[PDB]
């Protein structure tokens, strides 16, 4: 039971998938060639891997993942790497020519070309699950296939699968740095068309994770390998109440009902507290209440917007390690007494707790410390209403002179979809306003 | 002869209901395998109240372990007492609730209610004279509160004059382990008003205020907080199982507690718990079991009776003590401190003496008290419902299963009536 | 074809219980009775008869492809509560103006539960 | 050792490092299969 | 002295017959070559109900195996107990049936019914006081249904006072193992309703569900479903074979069962079936046989008796038990459940008690229920039959061997009137 | 007993019968010189000299295809009169292959079948292998099936055929032949399973990783479908299926006898390592349009009947559960008047790997023969290309001038113009 079908899309999605699936192989017993070291028990000893790994007859475990891209050069070091024998070859879908930072190329022209091939592969992985909790989506708004085809993945998921839970992690574009020039046209048009189709949507951006690896860990110059390692330690802590023994269990269904109050507002923000270096855990005792306070800290946040600008609509705390169910209570009661955190008026209950026994795993040659307790957090805040205002700013900028609009009009797409998907977002800017008013 | 068929629902019910069969089994001399290895004949004389007979001289409980996703019953099966349960008793679905009441009540639970009421109907009709059922569940969750009210609703229409108990775990006043708590707990007290015979309220901070302040446990898990719930699930049902100088079954405590039928929320306690180094300092007499039943800090309900008036009182005793001394203290606490007792009942306290103490203990004592200081448990859930409800907070997760908006209106207003129904007597 | 109901044993054949997590074909809970001799509605070699009222629908079944599927597909769930009246009206009009999507074999079976705030 | 079963007589076993859980209760063709616990918690 | 002649038709009848004769040979201690190797002396007293005696102490069964090609009886001979059947009791043809009721009834099965009648008349004129005949067959194929009903008609025109008893594998509701089933199912039900004295209805979905939720086999096979069918087949004829405190033969079961002549289709069940490793959680007493005979998820029929009303009920017990407990429970279930029992019959359950339990058990019991909630079978077959027949769906195959067009009409009118007869006795005051 | 007489007509019939008969020798113990170093009787017949000789007849009008058989490895296995050759071929012409050249050789094949029908005790029926595109596979084959009917009667006449592909084709004049033989066998044939060479090219490219396959990689896949149709006359099973069982469950009307073919677990030996191949995984992949053997899509029409032929280590409940998942999906849609739908058959002998082969060694298998309305495009596209050339009278002088009246072009186009309406109205509601 408890199966989860991971869907990775884009070069960002593939390179995040390579980080997570190395973590999952080490977390259970799996080698890089599929096999366990021999189980040395009677029959099947441990069946904990069934949420992520299947099993053939012979003793080979094949992941429940689909790796999607439109450029061939990203999957061809998954196919000829260390983990080239773990993946069944047909799970890794490549195109022949990529979407080239166009939403329109990735939605109408090249994405429709490749949609029905990968919705045959997710049928086969969803007919192997006795109980399916829900999918996972790993994308980035910036690219063509990370925005265009990913937004059309969610739309044809809603037709076929109904009200099945479709989570998504995302790389929202950064405020100061940026890869590309055409990213506001991409990022606006996909938040408009995934808006009624997605259940939940966690966001991080790469500039904030830059601020932690340089500062909290003692690793100057972090490559994307060090950022992708931290993303796998959030996905693992979301799904470790499904595989390892817990005191309080949390599913993948208890996040949408506890952080998404209103239909247009499904945008929580991730945080992970004891990300620390091996020279500076020789000195610090990591208690249960010492790592609770450091999910609310604006430095240790994982997006480049301060929660103090807004109001905490809810929370979701994920405690992982050697904790006590009483010292979880002994820290939450403290946090509510500060006046530098401010819960919204119509949420007097606030929280959602989760306690799990298996401590977080040490990857050989990784970044962090061998730590005995940890906390993950997904919190939903009104302080994201400052993030679309820096995206309405850079859409209306290049749209009032209509730069780059010819690269989307002749690419199979009419032009009135530009001047309505920024009007559609214009209600969402006032919709985040009225939940910021107190009920006088 | 006076059988009690146990029920347990959800990830709170299957963690309360797993330790309770580890406190009854050793109370009666039952191994992990199931066999009887006892050192008396009272350990086997009245064992049919809880244990069905199996083949070969082996005993099996009447537990109906219920869940909406079987993850939290794989851990129960792998414990030290996981093989004692008949595996047909496990009821489980595929996808859970998500801490949503309607999904547990109307949508996903209702597809699993007809498989439960085959199991209880196979056991309620395999009793010589069934006395009544139980239920261990939590109001904060989705399948404890959600379908666990559908169970009481659809068995009060099939066995309507037996006993139906519930050991609730109603939510907490400081820290709430689910955002959407006041929608679930308001909508479920409203069901329990017209559908239970008794119901005990348990808050989880009042269990924390014992194991830190009194038991002196530096690291109290929920193992040592389920062990306090299961040490008063057996005090209420002892005089059935063990002989007495004065007896009290479940009905007699029900008769002598409720003056009006809407008023059946109680608050438990348990006396002889003591700290680590203070066991050699303890005096061992009878009036030091009356000190700790009645001490206003050790109720399991997080509602101090100093705000309220004791409508009735119970007391169940375990040991070979004296009937003059038991009755002397009930005259004592009623006649020193008589601003906490109602006036139109001249003796509020019901007493009962079992004879067989818990193993290792020389005496023991259990309490149940019906108060007007328990309507403040129902005020606090009301304003956190009607703050959350007047701006239509989480309602699309609930109305999107097809609910009505005026159904929330009565479950507010029925709970507003019992708030003011209790409040006449203060 | 028509699905039917193994009367005692419909729970093993429930569609989510056979690992089919999508929308499925409904079943016939109640079988209606009739008596007598059944009229031969169709002549030899499978022709329908002239005066038998043929259905208005297409002969070949309505599978909506990818390049046939409408652009800007409406959502599967749309509860109208906690919404403004004009926004809920725009959602219902979005659902309304696509009758070909909601009528297909592989069509969207939507949800409109609740009333928006006036 | 030698303790009776009372509300304050349970102690941890700090030298245990795997807390994995197994799939005993599950489904089949359509049938709720509940099979015998070979291992405990952690693979032992 | 009360001999029973066995008739197996079709490949379903041949495999069920092979497993059933293996069961009886185990019960009476006949080894796979034919010599008695038993323990008691009760095993050898009334062996003549099934086994003819040859020279040299060999016991040859009283069975006739019929098929339209020998492709199944190669497989019957190559089994464990293939050497005990007489070589002359195998009747076969040269060309198959082809899932065609018309080729089973008129074209191919007419040249074979004479040989089968010769063999069964030779076995029937060797019995001292014969009781009747059993037929085990399937209502989906061409040899089993067509030729089987041809045999039933030509047996009951010649021996019209004996007992005719069929075990019929009627079609399943979810998955049909032949596209053209309901034609054969209708055209065989229309013959059974005239020419049988008892007919038990068996469904494979019901057998799969019992072998998964109750016996808890991970991979059941047909070699286990046939064991279930045979174990309830040889439990309705025990009191002809073993002593007891309240005997009952097949005539007595028919007399106490069927109140009207058109209403003789039954729903079986078998009590002490229990799991692999859950033997140490369950006691084996008479209430633990009663609550499992009468459980509605135990029927071998895929029709729920809670939609209708038990016209009559029979319970056949095996073992050394107490009459107070037996009669106490058969009264107790009737009084506790009184919307599923008709009222114009005041007591509904007939109980028989035999002495010798099956080899391995302490007790056993078998249940045969006659309900007005078996009409869902016929309503579902009638609706699928009119769906195909109104458009001439497969009708040329049937019409091209001389079948009329009025025969489908009269079959569907007959089955629909039988449905209305059930509904009249359900809704009677 | 339970014999089968294969008839192979044309180069596309002979070259399939070199890869069918290589399997049958090897599935039993038979060496390629006839000696075994008793289930072979459905395909072999023992001589008094120990030498097993097959029940088959190879026919061609050209000597350059059968003279490879008479020189190759299997030159001692075949009886010298079981391989018939002419001297001039039919040359992509219906008229030469039916009237002038095919008539001088039709009276000698029926001499050979009459001897091979006099040795079988219980003969199930014939099997035909031909190609619609050729001259002898389409002209002479339509002369066998006319003369088989009056001489043998109600014996079963199954046939396999290479239907023309939607884009690729060998010849120009292939739509004149593919209409003129469908019209004249439409009343004389029982069931016609059809594969086309283009959809098997898209399986060996995609399922196996064989870029640039050859006909010998295609003749081996067809031989694994013929082997699983007669698999229950030879090896012991739990649900047998004869050759009589196929016409009665897939031909609802006498003008509609064109099913399709699918064989599910075709994988390579580098992917059998990676995946379990249980009964539900191979059942679900028969209904998948990427794995069909004609380039027509069943989602754009209504199913009419199905027939599943399981083979190997299979269990009755995994068959019953996997079908009920197909009956729940919204994409497998059936016709109004077919409420039951299916036929199942379970065998025990797992499939046999050929040395030099391509498929992996597997433990379960499914062969599905389904009848669909979705074939209505396959005749309507072919009807365009007959009409397109014939509207201005192209290539007709190559047909009139050899024993053929000109009016057979207008009637064979009138007649199949009823078949397009015939498919249309049987899927229409009530
Ligand atoms: N956090 C994080 N972001 C990444 C990573 N790799 C790439 N990105 C982001 O990737 C975005 C650029 O688009 P991509 O996802 O790389 O490209 P794509 O999805 O294949 O789309 P196209 O290149 O247009 O076809 C930038 O916004 C980067 O921030 C990564 O490993 N971690
Ligand atoms: N699958 C398969 N198809 C073949 C094979 N050989 C030929 N074909 C098909 O045969 C068609 C050409 O007609 P043939 O059957 O080869 O020639 P023919 O029947 O002898 O006709 P004539 O040469 O005129 O006498 C082509 O369309 C091919 O599709 C083969 O070995 N395997
Ligand atoms: N006493 C006790 N309370 C618990 C336990 N687990 C959860 N709770 C309480 O129960 C509520 C959580 O509901 P839960 O039972 O997990 O949801 P459910 O599984 O849907 O019934 C919160 O109020 C918790 O404080 C436990 O093991 N023991
Ligand atoms: N219970 C059971 N059913 C069988 C067996 N063999 C075949 N069947 C059933 O027989 C039906 C098909 O009829 P068939 O046996 O082919 O009839 P025949 O043509 O007379 O041989 C299907 O419904 C199968 O489920 C068996 O060994 N046991
Ligand atoms: Mg790219
Ligand atoms: Mg040629």
């Amino acid at each position: 039971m408890r199966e989860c079908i991971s869907v990775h899309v884009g070069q960002a999605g593939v390179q995040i998938g390579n980080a997570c699936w190395e973590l999952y192989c080490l977390e259970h017993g799996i080698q890089p060639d599929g096999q366990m070291p021999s189980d040395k028990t009677i029959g099947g000893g441990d069946d904990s891997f069934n949420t992520f790994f299947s099993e053939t007859g012979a003793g080979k475990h094949v992941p429940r993942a689909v790796f999607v891209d439109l450029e061939p050069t990203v999957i061809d070091e998954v196919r000829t790497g260390t983990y080239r024998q773990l993946f069944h070859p047909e799970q890794l879908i490549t195109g022949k020519e990529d979407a080239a930072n166009n939403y329109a190329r990735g939605h109408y022209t090249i994405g429709k070309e490749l949609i029905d091939l990968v919705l045959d592969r997710i049928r086969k992985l969803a007919d192997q699950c006795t109980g399916l909790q829900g999918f996972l989506i790993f994308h980035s708004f910036g690219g063509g296939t990370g925005s265009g085809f990913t937004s059309l993945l969610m739309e044809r998921l809603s037709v076929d699968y109904g009200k099945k839970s479709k989570l998504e992690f995302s790389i929202y574009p950064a405020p100061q740095v940026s890869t590309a020039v055409v990213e506001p046209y991409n990022s606006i048009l996909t938040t408009h068309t995934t808006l009624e189709h997605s259940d939940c949507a966690f966001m991080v951006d790469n500039e904030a994770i830059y601020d932690i690896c340089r500062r909290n860990l003692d690793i100057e110059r972090p490559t994307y390998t060090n950022l992708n390692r931290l993303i796998g330690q959030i996905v693992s802590s979301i799904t470790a109440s499904l595989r390892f023994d817990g005191a309080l269990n949390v599913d993948l269904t208890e996040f949408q009902t506890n952080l998404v109050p209103y239909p247009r507002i499904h945008f929580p923000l991730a945080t992970y507290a004891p990300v620390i270096s091996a020279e500076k855990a020789y000195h610090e005792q990591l208690s249960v209440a010492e790592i609770t306070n450091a999910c609310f800290e604006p430095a240790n946040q994982m997006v480049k917007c301060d929660p103090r600008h807004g109001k905490y609509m809810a929370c979701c705390l994920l405690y992982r390690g050697d904790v006590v169910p009483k010292d979880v209570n002994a820290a939450i009661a403290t946090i509510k007494t500060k006046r530098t955190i401010q819960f919204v008026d119509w949420c007097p209950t606030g929280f959602k707790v989760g306690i799990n026994y298996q401590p977080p795993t040490v990857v050989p040659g990784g970044d962090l410390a061998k730590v005995q307790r940890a906390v993950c957090m997904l919190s939903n805040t009104t302080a994201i209403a400052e993030a679309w205002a820096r995206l309405d700013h850079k859409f209306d900028l290049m749209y009032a002179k209509r730069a780059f609009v010819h690269w989307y009009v002749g690419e199979g797409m009419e032009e009135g979809e530009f001047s309505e998907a920024r009007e559609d977002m214009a209600a969402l800017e006032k919709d985040y306003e009225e939940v910021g008013m107190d009920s006088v | 002869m006076r059988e009690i068929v146990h029920l347990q629902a959800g990830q709170c019910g299957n963690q309360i209901g797993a330790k309770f069969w580890e406190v009854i089994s050793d109370e009666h001399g039952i191994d992990p395998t199931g066999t009887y290895h006892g050192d008396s004949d009272l350990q086997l004389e009245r064992i049919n109240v809880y244990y069905n007979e199996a083949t070969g001289g082996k005993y099996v409980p009447r537990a109906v372990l219920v869940d909406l996703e079987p993850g939290t019953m794989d851990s129960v099966r792998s414990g030290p007492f996981g093989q004692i349960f008949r595996p047909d008793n496990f009821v489980f679905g595929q996808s859970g609730a998500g801490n949503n009441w309607a999904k547990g009540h109307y949508t996903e639970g209702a597809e699993l209610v007809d498989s439960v009421l085959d199991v209880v109907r196979k056991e309620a009709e395999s009793c010589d004279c069934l006395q009544g059922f139980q239920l261990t569940h939590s109001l904060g969750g989705g399948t404890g509160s959600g379908m666990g009210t559908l169970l009481i609703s659809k068995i009060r229409e099939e066995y309507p004059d037996r006993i139906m108990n519930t050991f609730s775990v109603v939510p907490s006043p400081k820290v709430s382990d689910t955002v959407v708590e006041p929608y679930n707990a308001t909508l479920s007290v409203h069901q329990l008003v017209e559908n239970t015979d008794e119901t005990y309220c348990i808050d989880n901070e009042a269990l924390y205020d014992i194991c830190f302040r009194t038991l002196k446990l530096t690291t109290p898990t929920y193992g040592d907080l389920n062990h306090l719930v299961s040490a008063t699930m057996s005090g209420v049902t002892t005089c059935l199982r063990f002989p007495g100088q004065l007896n009290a079954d479940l009905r007699k405590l029900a008769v002598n507690m409720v003056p009006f039928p809407r008023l059946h929320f109680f608050m438990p306690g348990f006396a002889p718990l003591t700290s680590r180094g203070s066991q050699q300092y303890r005096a061992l007499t009878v009036p030091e079991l009356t000190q700790q039943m009645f001490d206003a800090k050790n109720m399991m309900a997080a509602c101090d009776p100093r705000h309220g008036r004791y409508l009735t009182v119970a007391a169940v005793f375990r040991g070979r003590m004296s009937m003059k001394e038991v009755d002397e203290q009930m005259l004592n606490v009623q006649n020193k401190n008589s601003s906490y007792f109602v006036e139109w009942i001249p003796n509020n306290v019901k007493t009962a003496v079992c004879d067989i103490p818990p193993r290792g203990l020389k005496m023991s004592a259990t309490f149940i008290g019906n108060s007007t200081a328990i309507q403040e448990l129902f005020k606090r859930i009301s304003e956190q419902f009607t703050a959350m409800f007047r701006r239509k907070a989480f309602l699309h997760w609930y109305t999107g299963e097809g609910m009505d908006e005026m159904e929330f209106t009565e479950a507010e207003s029925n709970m507003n009536d019992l708030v003011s129904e209790y409040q006449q007597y203060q | 074809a028509t699905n039917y109901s193994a009367n005692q044993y419909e729970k093993p054949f429930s569609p989510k219980y056979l690992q089919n997590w999508s929308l499925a074909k409904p079943t016939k809970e109640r079988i209606s009775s009739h008596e007598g001799y059944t009229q031969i509605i169709a002549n030899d070699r499978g022709h329908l008869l002239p005066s038998v009222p043929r259905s208005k629908a297409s002969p070949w079944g309505s599978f909506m492809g990818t390049w046939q599927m409408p652009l800007k597909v409406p959502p599967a769930r749309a509860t109208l509560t906690s919404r403004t009246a004009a926004g809920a009206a725009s959602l219902t009009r979005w659902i309304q103006k696509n009758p070909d999507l909601l009528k297909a074999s592989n069509g969207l079976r939507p949800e409109i539960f609740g009333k928006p705030h006036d | 050792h030698g303790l009776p079963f009372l509300p304050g007589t349970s102690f941890k076993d700090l030298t245990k490092t795997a807390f994995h859980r197994s799939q005993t209760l599950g489904y089949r063709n359509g049938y709720a299969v509940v099979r015998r616990p070979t291992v405990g918690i952690g693979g032992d």
Side-chain angles (χ1 to χ4, degrees), chain B residues 343-357:
Chain B
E343 71 155 320
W344 40 264
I345 287 159
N347 197 12
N348 308 97
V349 186
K350 176 79 206 151
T351 73
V353 181
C354 167
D355 277 346
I356 308 299

mmCIF file of all heavy atoms in Angstrom, chain B residues 343-357:
data_model
loop_
_atom_site.group_PDB
_atom_site.id
_atom_site.type_symbol
_atom_site.label_atom_id
_atom_site.label_comp_id
_atom_site.label_asym_id
_atom_site.label_seq_id
_atom_site.Cartn_x
_atom_site.Cartn_y
_atom_site.Cartn_z
ATOM 1 N N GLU B 343 -27.146 21.271 45.678
ATOM 2 C CA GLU B 343 -27.950 21.253 46.883
ATOM 3 C C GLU B 343 -29.164 20.346 46.804
ATOM 4 O O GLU B 343 -29.636 19.903 47.854
ATOM 5 C CB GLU B 343 -28.393 22.670 47.263
ATOM 6 C CG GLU B 343 -29.436 23.300 46.369
ATOM 7 C CD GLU B 343 -30.239 24.371 47.083
ATOM 8 O OE1 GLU B 343 -30.586 24.165 48.264
ATOM 9 O OE2 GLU B 343 -30.516 25.423 46.469
ATOM 10 N N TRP B 344 -29.688 20.041 45.618
ATOM 11 C CA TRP B 344 -30.869 19.197 45.568
ATOM 12 C C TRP B 344 -30.536 17.738 45.388
ATOM 13 O O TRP B 344 -31.369 16.986 44.889
ATOM 14 C CB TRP B 344 -31.843 19.644 44.482
ATOM 15 C CG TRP B 344 -31.250 20.074 43.221
ATOM 16 C CD1 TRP B 344 -30.977 21.341 42.857
ATOM 17 C CD2 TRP B 344 -30.896 19.251 42.112
ATOM 18 N NE1 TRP B 344 -30.452 21.370 41.598
ATOM 19 C CE2 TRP B 344 -30.386 20.091 41.121
ATOM 20 C CE3 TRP B 344 -30.937 17.881 41.871
ATOM 21 C CZ2 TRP B 344 -29.927 19.614 39.907
ATOM 22 C CZ3 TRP B 344 -30.475 17.409 40.661
ATOM 23 C CH2 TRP B 344 -29.981 18.270 39.697
ATOM 24 N N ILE B 345 -29.337 17.313 45.768
ATOM 25 C CA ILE B 345 -29.034 15.907 45.978
ATOM 26 C C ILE B 345 -28.246 15.817 47.279
ATOM 27 O O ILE B 345 -27.132 16.344 47.364
ATOM 28 C CB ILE B 345 -28.242 15.270 44.823
ATOM 29 C CG1 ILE B 345 -29.114 15.068 43.590
ATOM 30 C CG2 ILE B 345 -27.723 13.923 45.248
ATOM 31 C CD1 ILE B 345 -28.330 14.921 42.307
ATOM 32 N N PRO B 346 -28.770 15.166 48.315
ATOM 33 C CA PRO B 346 -28.137 15.255 49.629
ATOM 34 C C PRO B 346 -26.986 14.301 49.850
ATOM 35 O O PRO B 346 -26.229 14.504 50.805
ATOM 36 C CB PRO B 346 -29.285 14.938 50.574
ATOM 37 C CG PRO B 346 -30.116 14.012 49.788
ATOM 38 C CD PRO B 346 -30.048 14.452 48.372
ATOM 39 N N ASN B 347 -26.834 13.257 49.042
ATOM 40 C CA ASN B 347 -25.612 12.453 49.068
ATOM 41 C C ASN B 347 -25.223 12.154 47.627
ATOM 42 O O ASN B 347 -25.817 11.286 46.982
ATOM 43 C CB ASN B 347 -25.772 11.171 49.863
ATOM 44 C CG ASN B 347 -24.438 10.570 50.229
ATOM 45 O OD1 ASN B 347 -23.403 11.215 50.090
ATOM 46 N ND2 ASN B 347 -24.449 9.334 50.693
ATOM 47 N N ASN B 348 -24.215 12.864 47.134
ATOM 48 C CA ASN B 348 -23.858 12.796 45.730
ATOM 49 C C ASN B 348 -22.963 11.614 45.393
ATOM 50 O O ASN B 348 -22.847 11.269 44.214
ATOM 51 C CB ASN B 348 -23.174 14.097 45.323
ATOM 52 C CG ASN B 348 -23.973 15.314 45.706
ATOM 53 O OD1 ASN B 348 -23.726 15.930 46.725
ATOM 54 N ND2 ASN B 348 -24.897 15.697 44.865
ATOM 55 N N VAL B 349 -22.351 10.965 46.380
ATOM 56 C CA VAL B 349 -21.233 10.056 46.132
ATOM 57 C C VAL B 349 -21.716 8.611 46.154
ATOM 58 O O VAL B 349 -22.298 8.156 47.142
ATOM 59 C CB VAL B 349 -20.104 10.274 47.151
ATOM 60 C CG1 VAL B 349 -18.919 9.431 46.790
ATOM 61 C CG2 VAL B 349 -19.693 11.711 47.169
ATOM 62 N N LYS B 350 -21.464 7.892 45.069
ATOM 63 C CA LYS B 350 -21.700 6.462 44.978
ATOM 64 C C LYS B 350 -20.393 5.733 45.231
ATOM 65 O O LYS B 350 -19.359 6.112 44.681
ATOM 66 C CB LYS B 350 -22.233 6.109 43.593
ATOM 67 C CG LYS B 350 -22.426 4.648 43.341
ATOM 68 C CD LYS B 350 -23.697 4.169 43.972
ATOM 69 C CE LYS B 350 -23.623 2.690 44.289
ATOM 70 N NZ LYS B 350 -24.474 2.312 45.456
ATOM 71 N N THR B 351 -20.428 4.693 46.065
ATOM 72 C CA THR B 351 -19.221 3.964 46.434
ATOM 73 C C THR B 351 -19.324 2.498 46.047
ATOM 74 O O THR B 351 -20.412 1.946 45.899
ATOM 75 C CB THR B 351 -18.933 4.032 47.928
ATOM 76 O OG1 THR B 351 -19.870 3.204 48.612
ATOM 77 C CG2 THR B 351 -19.049 5.445 48.450
ATOM 78 N N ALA B 352 -18.162 1.873 45.899
ATOM 79 C CA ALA B 352 -18.051 0.497 45.451
ATOM 80 C C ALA B 352 -16.687 -0.039 45.838
ATOM 81 O O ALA B 352 -15.690 0.671 45.728
ATOM 82 C CB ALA B 352 -18.230 0.388 43.942
ATOM 83 N N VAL B 353 -16.644 -1.289 46.287
ATOM 84 C CA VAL B 353 -15.418 -1.913 46.765
ATOM 85 C C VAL B 353 -15.242 -3.248 46.061
ATOM 86 O O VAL B 353 -15.930 -4.219 46.389
ATOM 87 C CB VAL B 353 -15.419 -2.122 48.282
ATOM 88 C CG1 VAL B 353 -14.112 -2.745 48.713
ATOM 89 C CG2 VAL B 353 -15.643 -0.825 49.026
ATOM 90 N N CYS B 354 -14.330 -3.301 45.097
ATOM 91 C CA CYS B 354 -13.765 -4.553 44.640
ATOM 92 C C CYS B 354 -12.691 -5.025 45.615
ATOM 93 O O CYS B 354 -12.221 -4.272 46.470
ATOM 94 C CB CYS B 354 -13.171 -4.395 43.257
ATOM 95 S SG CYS B 354 -12.153 -5.781 42.815
ATOM 96 N N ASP B 355 -12.276 -6.279 45.473
ATOM 97 C CA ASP B 355 -11.395 -6.894 46.448
ATOM 98 C C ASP B 355 -10.008 -7.207 45.931
ATOM 99 O O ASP B 355 -9.108 -7.421 46.746
ATOM 100 C CB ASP B 355 -12.001 -8.209 46.967
ATOM 101 C CG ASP B 355 -13.003 -7.998 48.074
ATOM 102 O OD1 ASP B 355 -13.048 -6.889 48.634
ATOM 103 O OD2 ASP B 355 -13.737 -8.948 48.400
ATOM 104 N N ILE B 356 -9.804 -7.260 44.619
ATOM 105 C CA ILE B 356 -8.586 -7.811 44.037
ATOM 106 C C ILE B 356 -7.742 -6.656 43.504
ATOM 107 O O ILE B 356 -8.071 -6.095 42.449
ATOM 108 C CB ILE B 356 -8.903 -8.811 42.927
ATOM 109 C CG1 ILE B 356 -9.894 -9.849 43.433
ATOM 110 C CG2 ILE B 356 -7.644 -9.467 42.464
ATOM 111 C CD1 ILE B 356 -9.385 -10.660 44.587
ATOM 112 N N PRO B 357 -6.643 -6.289 44.162
ATOM 113 C CA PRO B 357 -5.912 -5.083 43.780
ATOM 114 C C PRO B 357 -5.087 -5.325 42.533
ATOM 115 O O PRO B 357 -4.892 -6.481 42.134
ATOM 116 C CB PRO B 357 -5.018 -4.820 44.995
ATOM 117 C CG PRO B 357 -4.794 -6.126 45.577
ATOM 118 C CD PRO B 357 -5.987 -6.987 45.277
#
